[PDB]
Design an enzyme around this catalytic site. Structure first.
Site, PDB file in Angstrom:
ATOM      1  N   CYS D  87      15.060 -43.027 -64.132  1.00 31.84           N
ATOM      2  CA  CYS D  87      16.501 -43.231 -64.109  1.00 31.84           C
ATOM      3  C   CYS D  87      16.978 -44.662 -64.556  1.00 31.84           C
ATOM      4  CB  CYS D  87      17.078 -42.976 -62.731  1.00 31.84           C
ATOM      5  SG  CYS D  87      16.865 -41.280 -62.220  1.00 31.84           S
ATOM      6  N   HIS D 346      24.563 -37.235 -64.927  1.00 29.82           N
ATOM      7  CA  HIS D 346      23.352 -38.045 -64.781  1.00 29.82           C
ATOM      8  C   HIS D 346      22.310 -37.645 -65.816  1.00 29.82           C
ATOM      9  CE1 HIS D 346      19.550 -39.564 -63.187  1.00 29.82           C
ATOM     10  NE2 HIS D 346      20.245 -40.414 -62.452  1.00 29.82           N
ATOM     11  N   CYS D 376      18.976 -46.489 -58.896  1.00 29.61           N
ATOM     12  CA  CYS D 376      17.760 -46.129 -58.184  1.00 29.61           C
ATOM     13  C   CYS D 376      16.834 -45.368 -59.122  1.00 29.61           C
ATOM     14  CB  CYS D 376      18.079 -45.277 -56.954  1.00 29.61           C
ATOM     15  SG  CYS D 376      18.841 -43.683 -57.326  1.00 29.61           S
ATOM     16  N   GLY D 378      13.220 -43.000 -59.462  1.00 37.98           N
ATOM     17  CA  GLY D 378      12.247 -42.180 -58.768  1.00 37.98           C
ATOM     18  C   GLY D 378      10.880 -42.832 -58.721  1.00 37.98           C
TER      19      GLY D 378
HETATM   20  C1  LIG Z   1      21.382 -29.295 -57.046  1.00 39.40           C
HETATM   21  C2  LIG Z   1      20.445 -28.454 -57.919  1.00 39.40           C
HETATM   22  C3  LIG Z   1      19.153 -28.157 -57.151  1.00 39.40           C
HETATM   23  C4  LIG Z   1      21.114 -27.114 -58.241  1.00 39.40           C
HETATM   24  O1  LIG Z   1      22.400 -27.313 -58.834  1.00 39.40           O
HETATM   25  P1  LIG Z   1      22.861 -25.874 -59.396  1.00 39.40           P
HETATM   26  O2  LIG Z   1      23.283 -25.010 -58.269  1.00 39.40           O
HETATM   27  O3  LIG Z   1      21.604 -25.182 -60.126  1.00 39.40           O
HETATM   28  O4  LIG Z   1      24.053 -26.068 -60.470  1.00 39.40           O
HETATM   29  P2  LIG Z   1      25.446 -25.519 -59.869  1.00 39.40           P
HETATM   30  O5  LIG Z   1      25.733 -26.138 -58.556  1.00 39.40           O
HETATM   31  O6  LIG Z   1      26.642 -25.894 -60.882  1.00 39.40           O
HETATM   32  O7  LIG Z   1      25.385 -23.917 -59.708  1.00 39.40           O
HETATM   33  C5  LIG Z   1      26.736 -23.463 -59.770  1.00 39.40           C
HETATM   34  C6  LIG Z   1      27.168 -22.897 -58.417  1.00 39.40           C
HETATM   35  O8  LIG Z   1      27.560 -23.957 -57.527  1.00 39.40           O
HETATM   36  C7  LIG Z   1      29.009 -24.058 -57.517  1.00 39.40           C
HETATM   37  N1  LIG Z   1      29.390 -25.463 -57.707  1.00 39.40           N
HETATM   38  C8  LIG Z   1      28.926 -26.292 -58.682  1.00 39.40           C
HETATM   39  N2  LIG Z   1      29.456 -27.474 -58.558  1.00 39.40           N
HETATM   40  C9  LIG Z   1      30.293 -27.482 -57.493  1.00 39.40           C
HETATM   41  C10 LIG Z   1      31.119 -28.446 -56.889  1.00 39.40           C
HETATM   42  N3  LIG Z   1      31.190 -29.730 -57.401  1.00 39.40           N
HETATM   43  N4  LIG Z   1      31.829 -28.101 -55.821  1.00 39.40           N
HETATM   44  C11 LIG Z   1      31.763 -26.877 -55.331  1.00 39.40           C
HETATM   45  N5  LIG Z   1      31.004 -25.943 -55.862  1.00 39.40           N
HETATM   46  C12 LIG Z   1      30.258 -26.193 -56.933  1.00 39.40           C
HETATM   47  C13 LIG Z   1      29.488 -23.155 -58.689  1.00 39.40           C
HETATM   48  O9  LIG Z   1      30.793 -22.624 -58.451  1.00 39.40           O
HETATM   49  C14 LIG Z   1      28.421 -22.037 -58.627  1.00 39.40           C
HETATM   50  O10 LIG Z   1      28.683 -21.180 -57.513  1.00 39.40           O
HETATM   51  P3  LIG Z   1      27.487 -20.108 -57.353  1.00 39.40           P
HETATM   52  O11 LIG Z   1      26.384 -20.672 -56.323  1.00 39.40           O
HETATM   53  O12 LIG Z   1      28.050 -18.854 -56.802  1.00 39.40           O
HETATM   54  O13 LIG Z   1      26.801 -19.789 -58.776  1.00 39.40           O
HETATM   55  C15 LIG Z   1      20.140 -29.205 -59.223  1.00 39.40           C
HETATM   56  O14 LIG Z   1      21.311 -29.196 -60.043  1.00 39.40           O
HETATM   57  C16 LIG Z   1      19.747 -30.637 -58.947  1.00 39.40           C
HETATM   58  O15 LIG Z   1      18.660 -30.895 -58.477  1.00 39.40           O
HETATM   59  N6  LIG Z   1      20.606 -31.635 -59.236  1.00 39.40           N
HETATM   60  C17 LIG Z   1      20.241 -33.028 -58.967  1.00 39.40           C
HETATM   61  C18 LIG Z   1      19.247 -33.566 -59.997  1.00 39.40           C
HETATM   62  C19 LIG Z   1      18.947 -34.998 -59.639  1.00 39.40           C
HETATM   63  O16 LIG Z   1      18.545 -35.258 -58.527  1.00 39.40           O
HETATM   64  N7  LIG Z   1      19.132 -35.981 -60.544  1.00 39.40           N
HETATM   65  C20 LIG Z   1      18.852 -37.381 -60.202  1.00 39.40           C
HETATM   66  C21 LIG Z   1      17.349 -37.665 -60.232  1.00 39.40           C
HETATM   67  S1  LIG Z   1      16.946 -38.833 -58.905  1.00 39.40           S
END
Ligand SMILES: CC(C)(COP(=O)(O)OP(=O)(O)OC[C@H]1O[C@@H](n2cnc3c(N)ncnc32)[C@H](O)[C@@H]1OP(=O)(O)O)[C@@H](O)C(=O)NCCC(=O)NCCS
Ligand SMILES: CC(C)(COP(=O)(O)OP(=O)(O)OC[C@H]1O[C@@H](n2cnc3c(N)ncnc32)[C@H](O)[C@@H]1OP(=O)(O)O)[C@@H](O)C(=O)NCCC(=O)NCCS
Ligand SMILES: CC(C)(COP(=O)(O)OP(=O)(O)OC[C@H]1O[C@@H](n2cnc3c(N)ncnc32)[C@H](O)[C@@H]1OP(=O)(O)O)[C@@H](O)C(=O)NCCC(=O)NCCS
Ligand SMILES: CC(C)(COP(=O)(O)OP(=O)(O)OC[C@H]1O[C@@H](n2cnc3c(N)ncnc32)[C@H](O)[C@@H]1OP(=O)(O)O)[C@@H](O)C(=O)NCCC(=O)NCCS
Ligand SMILES: [Cl-]
Ligand SMILES: [Cl-]
Ligand SMILES: [Cl-]
Ligand SMILES: [Cl-]
Ligand SMILES: [Cl-]
Ligand SMILES: [Cl-]
Ligand SMILES: [Cl-]
Ligand SMILES: [Cl-]
Ligand SMILES: [Cl-]
Ligand SMILES: [Cl-]
Ligand SMILES: [Rb+]
Ligand SMILES: [Rb+]
Ligand SMILES: [Rb+]
Ligand SMILES: [Rb+]
Lengths: 390, 390, 390, 390
Positions: D87, D346, D376, D378
């Site tokens: 990162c 990100h 930060c 990883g």
């Molecule tokens: C969090 C994670 C595990 C999964 O995210 P994701 O669920 O696959 O992507 P989304 O959240 O957009 O999936 C969409 C769903 O969430 C909802 N949603 C997405 N963003 C939202 C928000 N800001 N508020 C409310 N709801 C949200 C969508 O409406 C959709 O609903 P559903 O569950 O019925 O499909 C993954 O994206 C992740 O690990 N992110 C972080 C990566 C990271 O750590 N980066 C830094 C490295 S240190």
């Protein structure tokens, strides 16, 4: 001695990656098996064997025909097996089940076909190990179902050979397709597919969806947009996605028993299998398959081509469907009254049993006596079967 | 009609990733098809149909049974198709080809089985697209050939069920295996496999290699190292790699014709198919498959168990092979005289015809009259067939 | 400030799919990090940063340079990062680590390179989903390491451009290779690689294996068999597998600190970094990289070509190594005395630090004063560094 | 000995599988490199080196940093290489480019970062060969970017450790996100991202699409819907998809030169690099990285925490951003005025240069004197840089 078709059923023909995008083939077969049993008043515990044609079973598990029988309620004391003769598999399985009862080796057979071309996986031989370089992930649907293993090109190219050999122009193939689209859409509006289609319940997580209508049938097929399509195989060819069949998912089967066994149960059979045949041709022109197979079937039944009142010839391609109608010379008005695979769909392992269902229920609907179902098979084969009403 | 076996042949059963590690299954079938024709004095242009059992055809192309017939010289006018009843496919295909001649729909059939488990690919459904996360590459040999689709465990677990259900100790299963190894090694040294094995030429780049001996048969199998092996399925079980069959490649087939047609050509048939049967059992104890299948086959032939002079029962597992000998109660000294699948190998789609080759050629050398071949089938099935010499 | 190399070490250069076939790159790097910290008497808690060049890190996890430092005992408070300049990565990291101490941002740097071309996987973008057809599994080693991203052909083709541009015949390129093989074979027998090679323990299941000798050095390289090989790139070319480097695994690094810090600890440094340079050229003739890069490094050091007593020029190809020796015109007897990458091996991310090890320990062994190490970089670049003994 | 930032630019941060779903990383970098050169009036032929941080380069070809420089018009004489500090890669490359000019080894550097997480492929080591059984296709984005190489769990679990260590409730983390969403949504409406965003032209087949707005910024983020998401890492945790960052694509870079070089060209620099630092921490609590890294950077600059007028701290997680702001104790109203990675996005390899652009252009917009950017990393690291305007 005399084998009849007590009942028959089929699932709606779904589009590629459509309603049945995540439904395994045996789940579609299990619904059809439960259907042909209920439609004849025959319990699952009476079935001796289940013969289901299937072309793309990779990744579905040990013998999906056995899985379809167990899921449909057929007890374990019965047997089940699949066979592969490509496109004529769904119809050859009915012939195989017919011989089981004729040879005294079985009493009640549920025979047909099932196919889920959407569920076909990509494979690669990786046991030897790729020391260096790139390798291909082979599509099992294209490789094991649609690519000729002797010349390397698609089945659409074999239709181009029949087009050049019989001098079938682009406008002639498009007109045949438009005729097929309008016949199927009319049969769908009038409900001529309701008796043969069994509704399938697609098990979902956020609500179930019932599928009971062929979703591949196009509404309002125009010839103007038909002639704007580019050829999908030969760069300067004539077969397009409009004048050719499609990739589809579906299942179809029938319940087989002797004419005496049907009389004991008070069942009125849909028809009587009087003859069948399968002949091979040149793989280059595999679309000509139904030509010598239909003649061999009619000869084994003692029938002439004019004796047939209804004909269901599979429309794998418009280029291959016109030559069969021109060589055999039968009345085109009795061939595919409710449309063909160009409009309805073409699940490879199930199309042989699909057109038999449409043939059986249309003979019952208009009082036809003699019928015939035939298909072309890749690699240079063709299968035909003659059905007579009782 | 009366159907006889004019000739039969098989390739050497190669080890997993061994001599046939890069040989497709249909190339092995073409050698066997050309063999049964050149062993019966029948030209390739006389074959009507080719029925080849195969369980793992993914990635081999459109209908490998058609490719095997075309490669072997069978003309395009003839037909060919494959079928899948798992481990009993090679023997069920012989029964299917027999029915083709009994119903008058064919005159000469080349029926058998072929399998190349080394060429089995890894597959994965990738049409929907993996949006995020890891996915598995499924081994088609494990999924479509060796894993029960109803309980999820390997076929070796079904042998563990037979082990506790029949109370078969670890020392009893190993002793059965050691007896099978020593019988096969003796038959190989004395040359009792020479008449049935047709040499296969492995086309290479830096020199061709002829394969004419079963490379899976181990020389000098000791019981001391047999009891040191760990169980390969259950952590506290009893089935090991020593008392179980192996993954192998091979092909086998036979030439089928009527007894009158064989007399017209002066052919001395290997035997006469007098009966056949296939029954289903519980998938948990699929090793008990040959028990009710052999009884129905003997009942259809009018034979008792004591009437049989020679028996070839497939040895998928030592835990499943002892129960068949205990329930049926036939003399174990006439069962697998030249060894079984524990020592020779077990190509799933071809094993049904493999033990038929071993049965036919052993009946010919010692003058046996009545024989029986049977195998267990995954998912809870079993197939048997009775052969009588002429 | 004045930056010196307190200590240096490297692992044996393993063959492709050889001794290090299943060893990740960071495990090789951790051994070298533990070596340079032990050979100079510096504790792990004193390391400020670890800079390891790596070209193929796919599938090894988050930041393999961090994994190498943590596995070697370097505490979490220190930092670590990797960099990618293809072949010159192992040498550029030493220059980068030198700049950290010169700018007063660090005191002790462990800089070098690591590479495991055997562990390089095949990848494929599958998030969109393959609706229909076959797709390629791309070899990351070929795609990300050996294929120029501007013209699409292998690095061996870029050597053919240098071969045609300088008019180096097949016999002249093969003769240069034979000289390199005989120099490496002699240095291995006399033990001139013992001081620089740190033994690596290959953690196995059935016994551990210590690797302390370069397994790619072939014994008895003959000129007769050298001219028998076919060209591996151009069908009518001149570069073969004999006069070119190979795919190899290995790791190498050095301990960087100021000249005053080494005097405090009583460390006798291997040499003093006096200058370095990196220049880019045409990607078609990327083998000409070391020509302007070595000239810029000598200019920054105030040295002439005749002042150098020992030179280590990377031998990626015989066609590119002769042009560098011909253009710069230095004495070939002082260039790669112990062989080059043609005989020893060429781990891409580690080759820069590998030839630095050979230069440092040979300068100490014969009392050489001025040294220079240089490599050619794919995509049209080159890196050089001048070392002076103390 | 004074390095300034002549110009800087960044692409719009696209959503996962969104506008940049099929755009390679170097194509985004090539646009940013061409942007910073035009925004300062410096020709491409004057750039000495291109340093682009990138974390997921698998499948993009040989050295994607070189591809970005050549495509942007930087001549072949210059060099280019990429580096990976997770990162903090986008910010560390700026510090590395700064050292090149400070040590007199370069005059003009284009340093930054690029990342295309949508283009990340699935990989698998297949050189040894899978003899039997299933194997996993590993997602390079998860494995090489988001999976801890020391404990095996996701980076969101490392955020749960920081959440439990500082006792940050679910309502406290969600409130921080809503504050970041409302700041970013307001800054997008007011156009405070127009000066830093360079429009990217997505070359398509059925029409080109211009991308000039961050599509990941959500409109109308409600606190009611924020408390309705389930935790995406720990089954009974507190980090959800709302209070955590997202997977995104983007690129950002800056033009580096000495303060005298900017005067000789009449350039108005965005800021002056006064100090930088990178420190390592415990991998379990990798979110606490910016805490000791910012202190070391402020110490090297001779600044106190109160001297900072504007701060851009990366918001990888709400659990890690609150602890950094609470420990360092700086005014939250000057930290991420226009939102953070929770709302904007990100891109791993580019986030270090992304927040540097937002910091530089906001200091110019409100007349800020002293700035600081920190992230930060990883595996237990953190990077910081102090910027002062001229
Ligand atoms: C969090 C994670 C595990 C999964 O995210 P994701 O669920 O696959 O992507 P989304 O959240 O957009 O999936 C969409 C769903 O969430 C909802 N949603 C997405 N963003 C939202 C928000 N800001 N508020 C409310 N709801 C949200 C969508 O409406 C959709 O609903 P559903 O569950 O019925 O499909 C993954 O994206 C992740 O690990 N992110 C972080 C990566 C990271 O750590 N980066 C830094 C490295 S240190
Ligand atoms: C021909 C084939 C390659 C088509 O693949 P496909 O491109 O996915 O077919 P699609 O309908 O999804 O795409 C065709 C396009 O033409 C259009 N189209 C199709 N049929 C049309 C019609 N009758 N009228 C007007 N437009 C039509 C559709 O809109 C479609 O989408 P597009 O215009 O945006 O591109 C494939 O379906 C096929 O091979 N069918 C024959 C089966 C076969 O070869 N053998 C069966 C066993 S022998
Ligand atoms: C059981 C099975 C998983 C074995 O896998 P395998 O590891 O490839 O078997 P292998 O023989 O290659 O290796 C087994 C080990 O036992 C040893 N072994 C096997 N048979 C032995 C014998 N008779 N004596 C001594 N040692 C023996 C092998 O040498 C090997 O030890 P190793 O590590 O030194 O090589 C597999 O052969 C199998 O499943 N067979 C049954 C097939 C089947 O299910 N068919 C359908 C039934 S209906
Ligand atoms: C050229 C290359 C593709 C070789 O492919 P390869 O076939 O796997 O090389 P091999 O190790 O298998 O050697 C191949 C054959 O040449 C023979 N051979 C190699 N070197 C030989 C020598 N010095 N003398 C005699 N024979 C030799 C081998 O014995 C082998 O014959 P075999 O197949 O009977 O065993 C590979 O080494 C390569 O790409 N090298 C370039 C590395 C590179 O590009 N680095 C970056 C450049 S900047
Ligand atoms: Cl019942
Ligand atoms: Cl019979
Ligand atoms: Cl519907
Ligand atoms: Cl009857
Ligand atoms: Cl007869
Ligand atoms: Cl013979
Ligand atoms: Cl012939
Ligand atoms: Cl395959
Ligand atoms: Cl799958
Ligand atoms: Cl049972
Ligand atoms: Rb169609
Ligand atoms: Rb065995
Ligand atoms: Rb070599
Ligand atoms: Rb978010």
């Amino acid at each position: 001695p005399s084998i009849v078709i007590a009942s028959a059923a089929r699932t709606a023909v779904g589009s590629f990656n459509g309603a049945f995008a995540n439904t395994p083939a045996h789940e579609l077969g299990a619904t059809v098996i439960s259907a042909v049993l209920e439609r004849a008043g025959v319990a699952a515990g009476e079935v001796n064997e289940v013969i289901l044609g299937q072309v793309l079973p990779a990744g579905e598990g040990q013998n999906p025909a056995r899985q379809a029988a167990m899921k449909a309620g057929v007890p374990q004391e019965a047997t089940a097996w699949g066979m592969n003769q490509l496109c004529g598999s769904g119809l050859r399985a009915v012939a195989l089940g017919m011989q089981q009862i004729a040879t005294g080796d079985a009493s009640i057979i549920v025979a047909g076909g099932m196919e889920s071309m959407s569920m076909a996986p990509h494979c690669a031989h990786l046991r030897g190990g790729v020391k260096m370089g790139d390798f291909k992930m082979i599509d099992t649907m294209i490789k094991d179902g649609l690519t000729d293993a002797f010349y390397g090109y698609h089945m659409g190219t074999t239709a181009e050979n029949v087009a050049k050999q019989w001098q079938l122009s682009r406008d002639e193939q498009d007109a045949f397709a438009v005729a097929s689209y309008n016949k199927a859409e009319a049969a769908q509006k009038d409900g001529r597919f309701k008796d043969e289609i069994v509704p399938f319940i697609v098990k979902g997580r956020k609500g179930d969806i019932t599928v009971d209508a062929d979703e591949y049938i196009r509404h309002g097929a125009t010839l103007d947009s038909m002639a704007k399509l580019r050829p999908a195989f030969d760069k300067e060819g004539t077969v397009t996605a409009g004048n050719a069949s499609g990739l589809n998912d579906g299942a179809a089967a029938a319940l087989l028993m002797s004419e005496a066994e049907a009389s004991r149960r008070g069942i009125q059979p849909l028809g009587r299998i009087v003859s069948w045949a399968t002949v091979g041709v040149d793989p280059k022109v595999m679309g000509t398959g139904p030509i010598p197979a239909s003649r061999k079937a009619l000869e084994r039944a003692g029938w002439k081509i004019g004796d047939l009142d209804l004909v269901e010839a599979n429309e794998a391609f418009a280029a291959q469907a016109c030559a069969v109608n021109k060589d055999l010379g039968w009345d085109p008005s009795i061939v595919n009254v409710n449309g063909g695979a160009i409009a309805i769909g073409h699940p490879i392992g199930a199309s042989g049993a699909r057109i038999l269902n449409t043939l059986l229920f249309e003979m019952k609907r208009r009082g036809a006596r003699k019928g015939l179902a035939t298909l072309c098979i890749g690699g240079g084969m063709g299968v035909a079967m003659c059905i007579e009403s009782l």
